[PDB]
Amino acid sequence: XXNXXYX
Amino acid sequence: XXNXXYX
Numbered sequence: 001x002x003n004x005x006y007x
Numbered sequence: 008x009x010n011x012x013y014x
């Protein structure tokens with residue numbers, strides 16, 4: 001909820 | 008590249 005990724 | 012972030 002306000003960070004990025006991709007997981 | 009090919010990863011994401013944000014730093």
Ligand SMILES: *[C@@H]1O[C@H](CO)[C@@H](O)[C@H](O)[C@H]1O[C@@H]1O[C@@H](C)[C@H](O)[C@@H](O)[C@H]1O
Pocket residue numbers: none
């Ligand atoms: C992710 O955030 C970046 C930087 O602000 C933005 O340029 C991208 O368009 C954004 O990606 C989209 O939204 C995310 C949630 C989806 O997983 C991705 O596939 C893309 O639609």
Ligand SMILES: *[C@@H]1O[C@H](CO)[C@@H](O)[C@H](O)[C@H]1O[C@@H]1O[C@@H](C)[C@H](O)[C@@H](O)[C@H]1O
Pocket residue numbers: none
């Ligand atoms: C990824 O994030 C950068 C940096 O902020 C932004 O300038 C790019 O436009 C962003 O890439 C897009 O969104 C991702 C999720 C897609 O895989 C990529 O093809 C591109 O559309």
Ligand SMILES: *[C@H]1C[C@](C)(N)[C@@H](O)[C@H](C)O1
Pocket residue numbers: 005006007009010011
């Ligand atoms: C985001 C990019 C990635 C780490 N290369 C991919 O494996 C993941 C599913 O999406």
Ligand SMILES: *[C@H]1C[C@](C)(N)[C@@H](O)[C@H](C)O1
Pocket residue numbers: 002003004012013014
């Ligand atoms: C990506 C999002 C973030 C972690 N909130 C921000 O601090 C960074 C500069 O960009």
